[PDB]
Design an enzyme around this catalytic site. Structure first.
Site, PDB file in Angstrom:
ATOM      1  N   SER A 205      -9.905  37.020  65.325  1.00  0.00           N
ATOM      2  CA  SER A 205      -9.143  37.494  64.240  1.00  0.00           C
ATOM      3  C   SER A 205      -7.818  38.160  64.853  1.00  0.00           C
ATOM      4  CB  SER A 205      -9.757  38.233  63.094  1.00  0.00           C
ATOM      5  OG  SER A 205     -10.603  37.723  62.383  1.00  0.00           O
TER       6      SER A 205
ATOM      7  N   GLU B 241     -15.378  25.381  64.391  1.00  0.00           N
ATOM      8  CA  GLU B 241     -15.931  26.334  63.727  1.00  0.00           C
ATOM      9  C   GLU B 241     -15.419  25.974  62.045  1.00  0.00           C
ATOM     10  OE1 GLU B 241     -13.439  30.024  63.002  1.00  0.00           O
ATOM     11  OE2 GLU B 241     -15.249  31.386  63.651  1.00  0.00           O
TER      12      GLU B 241
ATOM     13  N   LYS C 294      -1.031  32.904  83.606  1.00  0.00           N
ATOM     14  CA  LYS C 294      -0.772  32.066  84.614  1.00  0.00           C
ATOM     15  C   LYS C 294      -0.507  30.580  84.202  1.00  0.00           C
ATOM     16  CE  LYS C 294      -3.937  29.184  87.831  1.00  0.00           C
ATOM     17  NZ  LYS C 294      -5.210  28.502  87.912  1.00  0.00           N
TER      18      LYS C 294
END
Lengths: 138, 358, 358, 135, 102
Positions: free
Chosen positions: C166, C194, C335
């Site tokens: 969240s 999901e 990165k």
């Protein structure tokens, strides 16, 4: 192992032989009208029986009952049943017996399908077959 | 066998063909005779005209494979042999699967067979090896705008209401049960696996006569609380609630007890307290759906998990069996078949333990 | 024959062993005899001591396979037979090749053989069949100063965006997908493991026409909301978004679906919803990188965990496969191989569910 | 006999499976062949998909016990033989009972058998004799 | 032992000295409830842990099997199914080792 309608015919006898309250319902709905000779003659014997005002029990029935019916009517009184036929049970059995002449039927047009096929009348045999699917849906 | 089922089902529905063809092309069929039929079946659909025994026997004949299959005899056999066309898709999937398997084997065997004849390559051999292998109705709820989206609660539907611990899922189900009992004339059956039978009663005695801070629990009450419980007791006295708190019970028993109450007094709702606690869950969900359908009564199964679908899904099916899935958060009706999907907002008192309108 | 050359050349150089061992392990040899020798050869090298006729014959004797090969006679046969040790490497490559071929055959024959014994699986069979057989630039983000450090999103890179629950990682990836769809002309593929595919849509419908407090969820809208959805719907109605909410899918199926879409319509981005939820993860990370490489498309894999590197690293590799690792906190590009590493700062609306510039 | 009825009635209704499986697990069936069927029956219901002749014969074949029962012949025998599906549950109760009796017999036989081999225990023997008889 | 006594003499109460010391405890609680039920007699399990519910609960079920849960502190009847829930107070002598009325 025996086809359905036959088991229904069988089980119906087992019940009416054991409970003459069922036998009264079977009488107005099925003649018989039963599909097998042995089952017809028995039905007759069952129906009469109680119309002699007769109490009710197989010990009385299997003793009636020419003797050529006895090896059969004996082995039905021993079959396997709960005493108490469900509301639908009866409607399911009766449906089988009553719409048996209808199956025995479509094998008449069955012999007309295959005969049309042999004279190469392909599209007519198809129509007969498409008709059988309809009767079979019932 | 699965193959015959598809073909047979087409001669039956024959809107069976639509999903059959979504899933299979002719080549998926192992038998050629079936390949030829399914192709002709489709070749007819491509007009036209429509697709039935006659019309197909015709197309086959016209491309002269009629007797190269069965005759019309085998076409009639398929037809006359299959009972139901509510599968097909199926059936379809089965044949589709076994096709894929053949294709694996073929492209795999072709790799080994190819392993000795190149040698030579290694790198074309290994690359063209990945390349080859990669191929209102109803029953009123009590609550005005819940009723509107749903129209009930209606008979034969399984309603699953899920919410995280202590959001009020029980207190919500209870208030439904209560409204239905006190306001209609329809018996409700409650299975309260978790909380005891009488600890449940106060929670809906409180919910009525607007009783409790004073409190029922902490002994003594005011002349306002007393003269209140009496009416609350009285009004809930004539209600049609039946409670079963039996520790943790199997489905067959929920079904047995509910079955007996239907024939003796009436029944209109089954409100089972929480599913995750009845005694894999996918097998239970199925059984609750069937329970609802048998008794022509809405079954309200409570469940424990934001929220959203995959919160309960990952723990046992449910999704495809429940025809209405509510979430307490805001009541989010996230799935229903009646129609609409969205949020209905309720107020919640606490002191009285009531969910109220807005 | 080439097997005998390597073994031989070791007895000769015997610095020959080094290139031989860089290209072979004992198992590469077809004859056990040589396997045994080459192993002993190495096992002597692991001191030591060095490796020569007497010193190997002595290790073979020790572990008692001396007479289980040839005698010393076969070792000498090998030694005396070989005329030079300037090949070895070789020779090595030859044996290494013929080894790979035997493995190919074995794992391919294991598939056919496995084809009949399962049936049952089809999907496990087809997956452990790839598994077995396998063994500004750019695209603009929408967001001005994310583009600058990265210059895209470019084609063949795997981008991993991680953030605690969240924080907004989905809402972030969705806006990327949206901008790329509505503003460029490049198809985007979303896997939303999901959340449902339609609860996803309003989350990007809200993101546009700047809609919702009123709210889409809670039934009714004002004339300003209506006249808004209509264009938001309209604008998003021509975008190149494809969604797939399939509960929780394996890699090979992301890969198969994305592959088919590239040839038929285009494709520019694969935005997978969260990795930890796909179905060890190091073996998935690996596959996602390859997917991006095969399709010349940036793959955005969202991840679940301050933050920094070791928060995700401790749970399945990823680090060395992803060439750009974003964190939502601030967007921390921790990165990237394009060039720069630092913090880009984005505003976040909420009501509209948008991430916006600054 | 009751066993054939349950199996048959499933092929027929086949909402018959719901109450049959509420009362029976595969192991309740005395004949293996029926065990395998009823298991398959359920294994198919676990999707799925639904449950009927072809769909079941397909699962049996997949897990390769099709011909280990009857053929499709014994499946069809069962299907054609049954006249109604308003019992099932049944039938189920009967099979469930004969299952209960076998388990009684077994655990009891096990006690007697165990009577000679321990001796030794008496108290473990008498405790794991209530434990075994209570289950 | 309780079963045999019932048929030969009478029996009205089983007072077990402490449960945590009988020989997982949720499986014993279950059995003691069934023991009370089979013998139509009140079983009085004694238990070892302020107090309140979650003091014993965290150590083996009990809560849902025992229909009346007494605490010595005051005698706190914290759960009962007959009806009321509250505090009854008793005096305690010591020298005589008696609990007495008030």
């Amino acid at each position: 192992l025996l086809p359905a309608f036959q088991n229904a015919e069988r089980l119906l006898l087992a019940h009416m032989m054991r409970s003459r309250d069922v036998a009264l319902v079977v009488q107005e709905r099925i003649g018989g009208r039963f599909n097998i000779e042995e089952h017809r003659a028995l039905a007759a014997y069952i129906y009469a029986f109680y119309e002699e005002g007769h109490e009710a029990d197989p010990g009385a029935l299997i003793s009636r009952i020419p003797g050529e019916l006895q090896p059969l009517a004996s082995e039905l009184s021993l079959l396997l049943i709960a005493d108490d036929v469900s509301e639908q049970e009866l409607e399911d059995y009766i449906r089988h017996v009553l719409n048996r002449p209808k199956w025995l039927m479509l094998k008449v047009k069955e012999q007309e399908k295959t005969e049309a096929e042999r004279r190469k009348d392909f599209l007519t045999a198809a129509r007969i077959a498409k008709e059988m699917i309809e009767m079979k849906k019932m | 066998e699965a193959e015959q089922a598809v073909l047979g089902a087409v001669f039956l529905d024959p809107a069976a063909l639509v999903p059959a063809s979504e899933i299979l092309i002719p080549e998926d069929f192992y038998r050629a005779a079936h390949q030829k039929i399914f192709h002709a079946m489709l070749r007819v659909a491509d007009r036209g005209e429509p697709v039935d025994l006659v019309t197909v026997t015709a197309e086959l004949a016209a491309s002269e494979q009629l007797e190269e299959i069965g005759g019309v005899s085998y076409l009639s056999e398929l037809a006359d042999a299959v009972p139901t066309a509510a599968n097909v898709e199926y059936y379809a999937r089965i044949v589709e699967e076994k096709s894929v398997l053949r294709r694996l084997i073929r492209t795999a065997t072709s790799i080994a067979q190819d392993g000795y004849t190149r040698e030579d390559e290694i790198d074309v051999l290994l690359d063209e090896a990945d390349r080859k292998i990669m191929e209102i109705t109803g029953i009123p709820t009590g609550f005005t705008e819940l009723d509107r989206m749903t129209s009930g609660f209606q008979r034969s539907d399984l309603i699953i209401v899920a919410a995280r611990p202590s959001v009020g899922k029980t207190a919500f189900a209870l208030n439904i049960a209560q409204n239905v009992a006190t306001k209609t004339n329809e018996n409700v059956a409650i299975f309260s696996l978790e909380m005891s039978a009488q600890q449940l009663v106060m929670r809906m005695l409180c919910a009525e006569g607007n009783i409790n801070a004073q409190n029922l629990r902490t002994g003594k009450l005011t002349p306002e609380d007393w003269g209140k419980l009496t009416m609350a007791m009285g009004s809930l006295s004539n209600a049609g609630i039946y409670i079963d708190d039996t520790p943790s019970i199997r489905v067959s028993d929920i079904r047995a007890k509910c079955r007996r109450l239907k024939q003796e007094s009436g029944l209109g709702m089954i409100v089972i307290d929480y599913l995750q606690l009845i005694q894999e869950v996918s097998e239970i969900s199925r059984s609750l759906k069937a329970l609802a359908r048998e008794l022509e009564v809405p079954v309200i199964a409570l469940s424990q998990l934001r929220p959203m679908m995959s919160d309960i899904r990952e723990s046992g099916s449910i999704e495809q069996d429940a025809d209405i899935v509510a979430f307490l958060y805001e009541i989010i009706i996230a799935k229903q078949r009646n129609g609409p999907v969205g949020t209905v907002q309720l107020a919640f008192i606490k002191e009285y333990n009531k969910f109220v309108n807005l």
